[PDB]
Amino acid sequence: IRKGWLTINNIGIMKGGSKEYWFVLTAENLSWYKDDEEKEKKYMLSVDNLKLRDVEKGFMSSKHIFALFNTEQRNVYKDYRQLELACETQEEVDSWKASFLRAGVYPE
């Protein structure tokens, strides 16, 4: 539904803390790539089982932040703080959230 660059701020210390990844959001799958060639298909998140979450006051609010989480299945994607995602502006976060809603991701 929507493709573009998207930063993750919660990554295991053996790789790095913050890195930009290519993200493709569809109703069938949420596919994450190291680059914009759409060749690696490193992993995919579930669309219908995944949920959007807002973050409470107290998080680092210079970046615009939201989160992806799942609780119904054992496959919780390693729960890197319930897949916290961040963008430079609120418009990117809202466009992502709307794309998740169109894919089939339910609101909180």
PDB file of all heavy atoms in Angstrom, residues 55-92:
ATOM      1  N   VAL A  55       2.379   6.223  21.912  1.00  0.00           N
ATOM      2  CA  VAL A  55       3.343   6.277  23.005  1.00  0.00           C
ATOM      3  C   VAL A  55       2.910   7.354  23.989  1.00  0.00           C
ATOM      4  O   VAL A  55       2.398   8.407  23.591  1.00  0.00           O
ATOM      5  CB  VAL A  55       4.771   6.543  22.488  1.00  0.00           C
ATOM      6  CG1 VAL A  55       5.214   5.420  21.563  1.00  0.00           C
ATOM      7  CG2 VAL A  55       4.849   7.887  21.771  1.00  0.00           C
ATOM      8  N   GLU A  56       3.117   7.084  25.275  1.00  0.00           N
ATOM      9  CA  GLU A  56       2.719   8.004  26.327  1.00  0.00           C
ATOM     10  C   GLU A  56       3.690   9.176  26.416  1.00  0.00           C
ATOM     11  O   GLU A  56       4.818   9.126  25.918  1.00  0.00           O
ATOM     12  CB  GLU A  56       2.649   7.280  27.672  1.00  0.00           C
ATOM     13  CG  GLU A  56       1.601   6.181  27.734  1.00  0.00           C
ATOM     14  CD  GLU A  56       0.186   6.719  27.650  1.00  0.00           C
ATOM     15  OE1 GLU A  56      -0.075   7.801  28.216  1.00  0.00           O
ATOM     16  OE2 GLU A  56      -0.666   6.058  27.019  1.00  0.00           O
ATOM     17  N   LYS A  57       3.232  10.248  27.057  1.00  0.00           N
ATOM     18  CA  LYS A  57       4.107  11.375  27.345  1.00  0.00           C
ATOM     19  C   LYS A  57       5.305  10.915  28.167  1.00  0.00           C
ATOM     20  O   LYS A  57       5.169  10.132  29.112  1.00  0.00           O
ATOM     21  CB  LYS A  57       3.336  12.463  28.092  1.00  0.00           C
ATOM     22  CG  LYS A  57       4.141  13.724  28.365  1.00  0.00           C
ATOM     23  CD  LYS A  57       3.291  14.785  29.044  1.00  0.00           C
ATOM     24  CE  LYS A  57       4.092  16.044  29.329  1.00  0.00           C
ATOM     25  NZ  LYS A  57       3.268  17.090  29.996  1.00  0.00           N
ATOM     26  N   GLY A  58       6.485  11.407  27.799  1.00  0.00           N
ATOM     27  CA  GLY A  58       7.737  11.020  28.423  1.00  0.00           C
ATOM     28  C   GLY A  58       8.740  10.406  27.471  1.00  0.00           C
ATOM     29  O   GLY A  58       9.941  10.386  27.779  1.00  0.00           O
ATOM     30  N   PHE A  59       8.293   9.903  26.323  1.00  0.00           N
ATOM     31  CA  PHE A  59       9.207   9.452  25.287  1.00  0.00           C
ATOM     32  C   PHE A  59       9.872  10.645  24.606  1.00  0.00           C
ATOM     33  O   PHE A  59       9.397  11.783  24.675  1.00  0.00           O
ATOM     34  CB  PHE A  59       8.471   8.598  24.254  1.00  0.00           C
ATOM     35  CG  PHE A  59       8.063   7.245  24.765  1.00  0.00           C
ATOM     36  CD1 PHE A  59       7.074   7.119  25.725  1.00  0.00           C
ATOM     37  CD2 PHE A  59       8.670   6.098  24.282  1.00  0.00           C
ATOM     38  CE1 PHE A  59       6.698   5.875  26.195  1.00  0.00           C
ATOM     39  CE2 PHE A  59       8.299   4.850  24.748  1.00  0.00           C
ATOM     40  CZ  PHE A  59       7.312   4.739  25.705  1.00  0.00           C
ATOM     41  N   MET A  60      10.988  10.371  23.938  1.00  0.00           N
ATOM     42  CA  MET A  60      11.778  11.413  23.287  1.00  0.00           C
ATOM     43  C   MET A  60      10.971  11.977  22.127  1.00  0.00           C
ATOM     44  O   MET A  60      10.864  11.359  21.066  1.00  0.00           O
ATOM     45  CB  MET A  60      13.109  10.848  22.806  1.00  0.00           C
ATOM     46  CG  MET A  60      14.032  11.880  22.179  1.00  0.00           C
ATOM     47  SD  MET A  60      15.601  11.176  21.635  1.00  0.00           S
ATOM     48  CE  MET A  60      15.069  10.216  20.219  1.00  0.00           C
ATOM     49  N   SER A  61      10.397  13.162  22.327  1.00  0.00           N
ATOM     50  CA  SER A  61       9.377  13.698  21.438  1.00  0.00           C
ATOM     51  C   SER A  61       9.947  14.641  20.389  1.00  0.00           C
ATOM     52  O   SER A  61       9.182  15.349  19.727  1.00  0.00           O
ATOM     53  CB  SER A  61       8.298  14.417  22.251  1.00  0.00           C
ATOM     54  OG  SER A  61       8.838  15.528  22.944  1.00  0.00           O
ATOM     55  N   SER A  62      11.272  14.669  20.219  1.00  0.00           N
ATOM     56  CA  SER A  62      11.844  15.404  19.096  1.00  0.00           C
ATOM     57  C   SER A  62      11.606  14.652  17.794  1.00  0.00           C
ATOM     58  O   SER A  62      11.377  15.267  16.745  1.00  0.00           O
ATOM     59  CB  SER A  62      13.338  15.632  19.322  1.00  0.00           C
ATOM     60  OG  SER A  62      14.043  14.403  19.345  1.00  0.00           O
ATOM     61  N   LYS A  63      11.658  13.326  17.845  1.00  0.00           N
ATOM     62  CA  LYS A  63      11.185  12.480  16.763  1.00  0.00           C
ATOM     63  C   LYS A  63       9.713  12.164  16.998  1.00  0.00           C
ATOM     64  O   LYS A  63       9.258  12.068  18.140  1.00  0.00           O
ATOM     65  CB  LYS A  63      11.993  11.183  16.693  1.00  0.00           C
ATOM     66  CG  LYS A  63      13.494  11.385  16.530  1.00  0.00           C
ATOM     67  CD  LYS A  63      13.854  12.064  15.220  1.00  0.00           C
ATOM     68  CE  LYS A  63      15.364  12.153  15.058  1.00  0.00           C
ATOM     69  NZ  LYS A  63      15.766  12.860  13.813  1.00  0.00           N
ATOM     70  N   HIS A  64       8.966  12.000  15.909  1.00  0.00           N
ATOM     71  CA  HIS A  64       7.573  11.585  16.010  1.00  0.00           C
ATOM     72  C   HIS A  64       7.518  10.065  16.066  1.00  0.00           C
ATOM     73  O   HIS A  64       8.069   9.390  15.196  1.00  0.00           O
ATOM     74  CB  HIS A  64       6.768  12.132  14.833  1.00  0.00           C
ATOM     75  CG  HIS A  64       6.693  13.627  14.814  1.00  0.00           C
ATOM     76  ND1 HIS A  64       5.606  14.326  15.294  1.00  0.00           N
ATOM     77  CD2 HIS A  64       7.584  14.557  14.398  1.00  0.00           C
ATOM     78  CE1 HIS A  64       5.830  15.622  15.169  1.00  0.00           C
ATOM     79  NE2 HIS A  64       7.019  15.789  14.619  1.00  0.00           N
ATOM     80  N   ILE A  65       6.840   9.526  17.076  1.00  0.00           N
ATOM     81  CA  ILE A  65       6.994   8.125  17.444  1.00  0.00           C
ATOM     82  C   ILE A  65       5.634   7.443  17.496  1.00  0.00           C
ATOM     83  O   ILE A  65       4.636   8.039  17.915  1.00  0.00           O
ATOM     84  CB  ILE A  65       7.723   7.978  18.798  1.00  0.00           C
ATOM     85  CG1 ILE A  65       9.122   8.595  18.713  1.00  0.00           C
ATOM     86  CG2 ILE A  65       7.820   6.508  19.203  1.00  0.00           C
ATOM     87  CD1 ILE A  65       9.834   8.707  20.048  1.00  0.00           C
ATOM     88  N   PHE A  66       5.612   6.185  17.064  1.00  0.00           N
ATOM     89  CA  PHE A  66       4.480   5.285  17.229  1.00  0.00           C
ATOM     90  C   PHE A  66       5.070   3.896  17.424  1.00  0.00           C
ATOM     91  O   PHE A  66       6.290   3.730  17.440  1.00  0.00           O
ATOM     92  CB  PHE A  66       3.520   5.352  16.035  1.00  0.00           C
ATOM     93  CG  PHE A  66       4.123   4.888  14.738  1.00  0.00           C
ATOM     94  CD1 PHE A  66       3.681   3.723  14.134  1.00  0.00           C
ATOM     95  CD2 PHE A  66       5.124   5.618  14.118  1.00  0.00           C
ATOM     96  CE1 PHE A  66       4.228   3.292  12.940  1.00  0.00           C
ATOM     97  CE2 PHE A  66       5.675   5.193  12.924  1.00  0.00           C
ATOM     98  CZ  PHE A  66       5.225   4.028  12.334  1.00  0.00           C
ATOM     99  N   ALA A  67       4.218   2.893  17.620  1.00  0.00           N
ATOM    100  CA  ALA A  67       4.731   1.555  17.863  1.00  0.00           C
ATOM    101  C   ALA A  67       3.862   0.513  17.179  1.00  0.00           C
ATOM    102  O   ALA A  67       2.664   0.716  16.967  1.00  0.00           O
ATOM    103  CB  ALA A  67       4.807   1.257  19.367  1.00  0.00           C
ATOM    104  N   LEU A  68       4.487  -0.611  16.843  1.00  0.00           N
ATOM    105  CA  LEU A  68       3.796  -1.801  16.376  1.00  0.00           C
ATOM    106  C   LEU A  68       3.950  -2.881  17.438  1.00  0.00           C
ATOM    107  O   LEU A  68       5.037  -3.047  18.013  1.00  0.00           O
ATOM    108  CB  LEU A  68       4.366  -2.274  15.033  1.00  0.00           C
ATOM    109  CG  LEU A  68       4.318  -1.271  13.877  1.00  0.00           C
ATOM    110  CD1 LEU A  68       5.021  -1.827  12.646  1.00  0.00           C
ATOM    111  CD2 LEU A  68       2.888  -0.899  13.550  1.00  0.00           C
ATOM    112  N   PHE A  69       2.862  -3.600  17.720  1.00  0.00           N
ATOM    113  CA  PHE A  69       2.926  -4.651  18.728  1.00  0.00           C
ATOM    114  C   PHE A  69       1.991  -5.789  18.352  1.00  0.00           C
ATOM    115  O   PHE A  69       1.052  -5.621  17.572  1.00  0.00           O
ATOM    116  CB  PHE A  69       2.552  -4.129  20.121  1.00  0.00           C
ATOM    117  CG  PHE A  69       1.111  -3.732  20.261  1.00  0.00           C
ATOM    118  CD1 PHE A  69       0.262  -4.458  21.079  1.00  0.00           C
ATOM    119  CD2 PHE A  69       0.605  -2.636  19.584  1.00  0.00           C
ATOM    120  CE1 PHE A  69      -1.064  -4.102  21.217  1.00  0.00           C
ATOM    121  CE2 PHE A  69      -0.721  -2.277  19.719  1.00  0.00           C
ATOM    122  CZ  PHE A  69      -1.557  -3.009  20.538  1.00  0.00           C
ATOM    123  N   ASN A  70       2.247  -6.951  18.950  1.00  0.00           N
ATOM    124  CA  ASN A  70       1.351  -8.093  18.867  1.00  0.00           C
ATOM    125  C   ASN A  70       1.366  -8.821  20.202  1.00  0.00           C
ATOM    126  O   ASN A  70       2.403  -8.890  20.867  1.00  0.00           O
ATOM    127  CB  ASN A  70       1.759  -9.048  17.737  1.00  0.00           C
ATOM    128  CG  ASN A  70       0.733 -10.138  17.497  1.00  0.00           C
ATOM    129  OD1 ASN A  70      -0.330 -10.155  18.116  1.00  0.00           O
ATOM    130  ND2 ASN A  70       1.049 -11.058  16.592  1.00  0.00           N
ATOM    131  N   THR A  71       0.210  -9.362  20.587  1.00  0.00           N
ATOM    132  CA  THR A  71       0.082 -10.062  21.861  1.00  0.00           C
ATOM    133  C   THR A  71      -0.675 -11.377  21.772  1.00  0.00           C
ATOM    134  O   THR A  71      -0.728 -12.094  22.776  1.00  0.00           O
ATOM    135  CB  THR A  71      -0.616  -9.166  22.896  1.00  0.00           C
ATOM    136  OG1 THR A  71      -1.938  -8.846  22.443  1.00  0.00           O
ATOM    137  CG2 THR A  71       0.171  -7.880  23.113  1.00  0.00           C
ATOM    138  N   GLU A  72      -1.257 -11.726  20.627  1.00  0.00           N
ATOM    139  CA  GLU A  72      -2.129 -12.888  20.523  1.00  0.00           C
ATOM    140  C   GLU A  72      -1.382 -14.170  20.181  1.00  0.00           C
ATOM    141  O   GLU A  72      -1.952 -15.256  20.335  1.00  0.00           O
ATOM    142  CB  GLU A  72      -3.210 -12.638  19.466  1.00  0.00           C
ATOM    143  CG  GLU A  72      -4.164 -11.506  19.816  1.00  0.00           C
ATOM    144  CD  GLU A  72      -5.200 -11.261  18.737  1.00  0.00           C
ATOM    145  OE1 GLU A  72      -5.114 -11.906  17.671  1.00  0.00           O
ATOM    146  OE2 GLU A  72      -6.102 -10.425  18.954  1.00  0.00           O
ATOM    147  N   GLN A  73      -0.134 -14.079  19.724  1.00  0.00           N
ATOM    148  CA  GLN A  73       0.618 -15.248  19.294  1.00  0.00           C
ATOM    149  C   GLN A  73       2.029 -15.183  19.861  1.00  0.00           C
ATOM    150  O   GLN A  73       2.536 -14.114  20.208  1.00  0.00           O
ATOM    151  CB  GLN A  73       0.671 -15.352  17.763  1.00  0.00           C
ATOM    152  CG  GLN A  73      -0.689 -15.521  17.103  1.00  0.00           C
ATOM    153  CD  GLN A  73      -1.422 -14.206  16.916  1.00  0.00           C
ATOM    154  OE1 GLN A  73      -0.817 -13.134  16.942  1.00  0.00           O
ATOM    155  NE2 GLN A  73      -2.734 -14.281  16.727  1.00  0.00           N
ATOM    156  N   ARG A  74       2.660 -16.357  19.949  1.00  0.00           N
ATOM    157  CA  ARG A  74       4.023 -16.443  20.459  1.00  0.00           C
ATOM    158  C   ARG A  74       5.010 -15.680  19.587  1.00  0.00           C
ATOM    159  O   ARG A  74       6.068 -15.268  20.078  1.00  0.00           O
ATOM    160  CB  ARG A  74       4.454 -17.907  20.553  1.00  0.00           C
ATOM    161  CG  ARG A  74       3.739 -18.706  21.628  1.00  0.00           C
ATOM    162  CD  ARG A  74       4.187 -20.159  21.614  1.00  0.00           C
ATOM    163  NE  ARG A  74       3.513 -20.960  22.631  1.00  0.00           N
ATOM    164  CZ  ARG A  74       3.630 -22.279  22.743  1.00  0.00           C
ATOM    165  NH1 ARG A  74       4.397 -22.958  21.899  1.00  0.00           N
ATOM    166  NH2 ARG A  74       2.979 -22.924  23.701  1.00  0.00           N
ATOM    167  N   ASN A  75       4.690 -15.483  18.311  1.00  0.00           N
ATOM    168  CA  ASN A  75       5.550 -14.762  17.374  1.00  0.00           C
ATOM    169  C   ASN A  75       5.327 -13.267  17.551  1.00  0.00           C
ATOM    170  O   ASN A  75       4.413 -12.678  16.972  1.00  0.00           O
ATOM    171  CB  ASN A  75       5.268 -15.201  15.943  1.00  0.00           C
ATOM    172  CG  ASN A  75       6.250 -14.614  14.948  1.00  0.00           C
ATOM    173  OD1 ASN A  75       7.169 -13.886  15.323  1.00  0.00           O
ATOM    174  ND2 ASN A  75       6.060 -14.928  13.673  1.00  0.00           N
ATOM    175  N   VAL A  76       6.176 -12.642  18.364  1.00  0.00           N
ATOM    176  CA  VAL A  76       6.051 -11.228  18.690  1.00  0.00           C
ATOM    177  C   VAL A  76       7.240 -10.431  18.155  1.00  0.00           C
ATOM    178  O   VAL A  76       7.486  -9.311  18.589  1.00  0.00           O
ATOM    179  CB  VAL A  76       5.881 -11.021  20.208  1.00  0.00           C
ATOM    180  CG1 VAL A  76       4.594 -11.672  20.691  1.00  0.00           C
ATOM    181  CG2 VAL A  76       7.083 -11.574  20.964  1.00  0.00           C
ATOM    182  N   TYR A  77       7.981 -11.008  17.210  1.00  0.00           N
ATOM    183  CA  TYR A  77       9.017 -10.309  16.456  1.00  0.00           C
ATOM    184  C   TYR A  77      10.183  -9.854  17.328  1.00  0.00           C
ATOM    185  O   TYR A  77      10.892  -8.909  16.969  1.00  0.00           O
ATOM    186  CB  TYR A  77       8.422  -9.114  15.706  1.00  0.00           C
ATOM    187  CG  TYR A  77       7.119  -9.443  15.013  1.00  0.00           C
ATOM    188  CD1 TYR A  77       5.917  -8.917  15.468  1.00  0.00           C
ATOM    189  CD2 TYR A  77       7.091 -10.275  13.902  1.00  0.00           C
ATOM    190  CE1 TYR A  77       4.723  -9.212  14.837  1.00  0.00           C
ATOM    191  CE2 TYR A  77       5.902 -10.571  13.261  1.00  0.00           C
ATOM    192  CZ  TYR A  77       4.722 -10.039  13.735  1.00  0.00           C
ATOM    193  OH  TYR A  77       3.535 -10.339  13.107  1.00  0.00           O
ATOM    194  N   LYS A  78      10.385 -10.496  18.477  1.00  0.00           N
ATOM    195  CA  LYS A  78      11.444 -10.222  19.449  1.00  0.00           C
ATOM    196  C   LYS A  78      11.093  -9.046  20.356  1.00  0.00           C
ATOM    197  O   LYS A  78      11.878  -8.737  21.263  1.00  0.00           O
ATOM    198  CB  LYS A  78      12.807  -9.946  18.794  1.00  0.00           C
ATOM    199  CG  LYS A  78      13.319 -11.080  17.919  1.00  0.00           C
ATOM    200  CD  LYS A  78      14.705 -10.775  17.374  1.00  0.00           C
ATOM    201  CE  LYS A  78      15.210 -11.890  16.475  1.00  0.00           C
ATOM    202  NZ  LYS A  78      16.553 -11.585  15.909  1.00  0.00           N
ATOM    203  N   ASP A  79       9.953  -8.394  20.156  1.00  0.00           N
ATOM    204  CA  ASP A  79       9.483  -7.312  21.018  1.00  0.00           C
ATOM    205  C   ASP A  79      10.603  -6.324  21.350  1.00  0.00           C
ATOM    206  O   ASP A  79      10.989  -6.135  22.504  1.00  0.00           O
ATOM    207  CB  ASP A  79       8.863  -7.876  22.295  1.00  0.00           C
ATOM    208  CG  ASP A  79       8.114  -6.827  23.093  1.00  0.00           C
ATOM    209  OD1 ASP A  79       7.796  -5.760  22.527  1.00  0.00           O
ATOM    210  OD2 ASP A  79       7.842  -7.068  24.288  1.00  0.00           O
ATOM    211  N   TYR A  80      11.128  -5.688  20.303  1.00  0.00           N
ATOM    212  CA  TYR A  80      12.062  -4.584  20.492  1.00  0.00           C
ATOM    213  C   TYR A  80      11.313  -3.355  20.992  1.00  0.00           C
ATOM    214  O   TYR A  80      11.171  -2.364  20.267  1.00  0.00           O
ATOM    215  CB  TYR A  80      12.804  -4.248  19.196  1.00  0.00           C
ATOM    216  CG  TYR A  80      13.774  -5.310  18.730  1.00  0.00           C
ATOM    217  CD1 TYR A  80      13.417  -6.230  17.755  1.00  0.00           C
ATOM    218  CD2 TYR A  80      15.060  -5.376  19.252  1.00  0.00           C
ATOM    219  CE1 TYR A  80      14.307  -7.194  17.322  1.00  0.00           C
ATOM    220  CE2 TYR A  80      15.956  -6.339  18.828  1.00  0.00           C
ATOM    221  CZ  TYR A  80      15.574  -7.244  17.862  1.00  0.00           C
ATOM    222  OH  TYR A  80      16.465  -8.202  17.435  1.00  0.00           O
ATOM    223  N   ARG A  81      10.827  -3.418  22.232  1.00  0.00           N
ATOM    224  CA  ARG A  81       9.937  -2.399  22.787  1.00  0.00           C
ATOM    225  C   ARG A  81       8.663  -2.278  21.953  1.00  0.00           C
ATOM    226  O   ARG A  81       8.230  -1.182  21.588  1.00  0.00           O
ATOM    227  CB  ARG A  81      10.647  -1.050  22.914  1.00  0.00           C
ATOM    228  CG  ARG A  81      11.841  -1.072  23.855  1.00  0.00           C
ATOM    229  CD  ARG A  81      12.449   0.309  24.020  1.00  0.00           C
ATOM    230  NE  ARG A  81      13.598   0.301  24.921  1.00  0.00           N
ATOM    231  CZ  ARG A  81      14.349   1.365  25.191  1.00  0.00           C
ATOM    232  NH1 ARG A  81      14.078   2.536  24.628  1.00  0.00           N
ATOM    233  NH2 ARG A  81      15.373   1.259  26.025  1.00  0.00           N
ATOM    234  N   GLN A  82       8.058  -3.427  21.658  1.00  0.00           N
ATOM    235  CA  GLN A  82       6.809  -3.494  20.903  1.00  0.00           C
ATOM    236  C   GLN A  82       6.882  -2.668  19.619  1.00  0.00           C
ATOM    237  O   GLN A  82       6.027  -1.826  19.338  1.00  0.00           O
ATOM    238  CB  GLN A  82       5.644  -3.040  21.780  1.00  0.00           C
ATOM    239  CG  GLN A  82       5.434  -3.899  23.016  1.00  0.00           C
ATOM    240  CD  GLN A  82       4.254  -3.443  23.848  1.00  0.00           C
ATOM    241  OE1 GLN A  82       3.545  -2.507  23.478  1.00  0.00           O
ATOM    242  NE2 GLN A  82       4.037  -4.103  24.980  1.00  0.00           N
ATOM    243  N   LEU A  83       7.921  -2.922  18.833  1.00  0.00           N
ATOM    244  CA  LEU A  83       8.346  -2.474  17.508  1.00  0.00           C
ATOM    245  C   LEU A  83       8.141  -0.966  17.357  1.00  0.00           C
ATOM    246  O   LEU A  83       7.380  -0.490  16.514  1.00  0.00           O
ATOM    247  CB  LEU A  83       7.626  -3.247  16.408  1.00  0.00           C
ATOM    248  CG  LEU A  83       7.829  -4.765  16.388  1.00  0.00           C
ATOM    249  CD1 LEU A  83       6.964  -5.399  15.311  1.00  0.00           C
ATOM    250  CD2 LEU A  83       9.294  -5.122  16.174  1.00  0.00           C
ATOM    251  N   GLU A  84       8.751  -0.224  18.278  1.00  0.00           N
ATOM    252  CA  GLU A  84       8.721   1.232  18.209  1.00  0.00           C
ATOM    253  C   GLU A  84       9.325   1.731  16.900  1.00  0.00           C
ATOM    254  O   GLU A  84      10.437   1.349  16.526  1.00  0.00           O
ATOM    255  CB  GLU A  84       9.476   1.827  19.398  1.00  0.00           C
ATOM    256  CG  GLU A  84       9.423   3.345  19.471  1.00  0.00           C
ATOM    257  CD  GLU A  84      10.155   3.896  20.679  1.00  0.00           C
ATOM    258  OE1 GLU A  84      10.226   3.189  21.707  1.00  0.00           O
ATOM    259  OE2 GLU A  84      10.658   5.036  20.601  1.00  0.00           O
ATOM    260  N   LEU A  85       8.578   2.587  16.207  1.00  0.00           N
ATOM    261  CA  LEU A  85       8.975   3.188  14.944  1.00  0.00           C
ATOM    262  C   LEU A  85       8.921   4.704  15.084  1.00  0.00           C
ATOM    263  O   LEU A  85       8.122   5.242  15.861  1.00  0.00           O
ATOM    264  CB  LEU A  85       8.062   2.726  13.803  1.00  0.00           C
ATOM    265  CG  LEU A  85       8.031   1.214  13.563  1.00  0.00           C
ATOM    266  CD1 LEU A  85       6.989   0.856  12.520  1.00  0.00           C
ATOM    267  CD2 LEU A  85       9.399   0.698  13.146  1.00  0.00           C
ATOM    268  N   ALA A  86       9.778   5.397  14.334  1.00  0.00           N
ATOM    269  CA  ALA A  86       9.877   6.844  14.447  1.00  0.00           C
ATOM    270  C   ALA A  86      10.116   7.476  13.082  1.00  0.00           C
ATOM    271  O   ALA A  86      10.648   6.846  12.165  1.00  0.00           O
ATOM    272  CB  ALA A  86      11.006   7.252  15.404  1.00  0.00           C
ATOM    273  N   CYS A  87       9.704   8.738  12.971  1.00  0.00           N
ATOM    274  CA  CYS A  87       9.829   9.529  11.757  1.00  0.00           C
ATOM    275  C   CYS A  87      10.235  10.949  12.128  1.00  0.00           C
ATOM    276  O   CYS A  87      10.170  11.360  13.294  1.00  0.00           O
ATOM    277  CB  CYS A  87       8.520   9.557  10.961  1.00  0.00           C
ATOM    278  SG  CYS A  87       7.911   7.944  10.445  1.00  0.00           S
ATOM    279  N   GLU A  88      10.632  11.707  11.104  1.00  0.00           N
ATOM    280  CA  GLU A  88      11.064  13.085  11.301  1.00  0.00           C
ATOM    281  C   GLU A  88       9.890  14.027  11.536  1.00  0.00           C
ATOM    282  O   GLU A  88      10.046  15.039  12.229  1.00  0.00           O
ATOM    283  CB  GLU A  88      11.867  13.560  10.088  1.00  0.00           C
ATOM    284  CG  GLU A  88      13.196  12.845   9.898  1.00  0.00           C
ATOM    285  CD  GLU A  88      14.154  13.076  11.048  1.00  0.00           C
ATOM    286  OE1 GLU A  88      14.556  14.239  11.266  1.00  0.00           O
ATOM    287  OE2 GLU A  88      14.506  12.094  11.734  1.00  0.00           O
ATOM    288  N   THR A  89       8.720  13.719  10.978  1.00  0.00           N
ATOM    289  CA  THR A  89       7.552  14.579  11.087  1.00  0.00           C
ATOM    290  C   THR A  89       6.329  13.754  11.468  1.00  0.00           C
ATOM    291  O   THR A  89       6.310  12.528  11.334  1.00  0.00           O
ATOM    292  CB  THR A  89       7.280  15.329   9.775  1.00  0.00           C
ATOM    293  OG1 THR A  89       6.869  14.399   8.763  1.00  0.00           O
ATOM    294  CG2 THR A  89       8.529  16.067   9.307  1.00  0.00           C
ATOM    295  N   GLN A  90       5.300  14.456  11.949  1.00  0.00           N
ATOM    296  CA  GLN A  90       4.031  13.808  12.266  1.00  0.00           C
ATOM    297  C   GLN A  90       3.313  13.318  11.015  1.00  0.00           C
ATOM    298  O   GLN A  90       2.577  12.326  11.077  1.00  0.00           O
ATOM    299  CB  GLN A  90       3.125  14.768  13.038  1.00  0.00           C
ATOM    300  CG  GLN A  90       1.850  14.129  13.571  1.00  0.00           C
ATOM    301  CD  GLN A  90       2.125  13.008  14.556  1.00  0.00           C
ATOM    302  OE1 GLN A  90       3.016  13.113  15.399  1.00  0.00           O
ATOM    303  NE2 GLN A  90       1.339  11.940  14.472  1.00  0.00           N
ATOM    304  N   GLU A  91       3.491  14.003   9.883  1.00  0.00           N
ATOM    305  CA  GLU A  91       2.793  13.600   8.666  1.00  0.00           C
ATOM    306  C   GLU A  91       3.212  12.206   8.217  1.00  0.00           C
ATOM    307  O   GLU A  91       2.374  11.413   7.778  1.00  0.00           O
ATOM    308  CB  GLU A  91       3.045  14.617   7.553  1.00  0.00           C
ATOM    309  CG  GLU A  91       2.432  15.989   7.808  1.00  0.00           C
ATOM    310  CD  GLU A  91       3.270  16.851   8.732  1.00  0.00           C
ATOM    311  OE1 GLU A  91       4.343  16.389   9.170  1.00  0.00           O
ATOM    312  OE2 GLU A  91       2.853  17.992   9.021  1.00  0.00           O
ATOM    313  N   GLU A  92       4.500  11.877   8.338  1.00  0.00           N
ATOM    314  CA  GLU A  92       4.943  10.535   7.976  1.00  0.00           C
ATOM    315  C   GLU A  92       4.348   9.485   8.907  1.00  0.00           C
ATOM    316  O   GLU A  92       3.920   8.418   8.453  1.00  0.00           O
ATOM    317  CB  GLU A  92       6.471  10.464   7.987  1.00  0.00           C
ATOM    318  CG  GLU A  92       7.128  11.261   6.871  1.00  0.00           C
ATOM    319  CD  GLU A  92       8.643  11.231   6.938  1.00  0.00           C
ATOM    320  OE1 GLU A  92       9.188  10.687   7.921  1.00  0.00           O
ATOM    321  OE2 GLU A  92       9.291  11.751   6.006  1.00  0.00           O
TER     322      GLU A  92
END
